[PDB]
Amino acid sequence: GIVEQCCTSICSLYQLENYCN
Amino acid sequence: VNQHLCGSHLVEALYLVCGERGFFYTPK
Ligand SMILES: [Zn+2]
Incomplete structure (x- = not known):
């Protein structure tokens, strides 16, 4: 979830x- | 939306933030 959580926002x-x- | 390019940055940020505690990086 770090990629989901910190790449869009x-x-x-x-x-x-x-x-x- | 290039997660691979994004990931490169994420790993550098975690290096600075985690310091001596380290981290596990899993591209899930
Ligand atoms: Zn870059």
């Missing part, structure tokens, strides 16, 4: 942290 670093290890 802009993701903040706050949203992106959800994908870290």
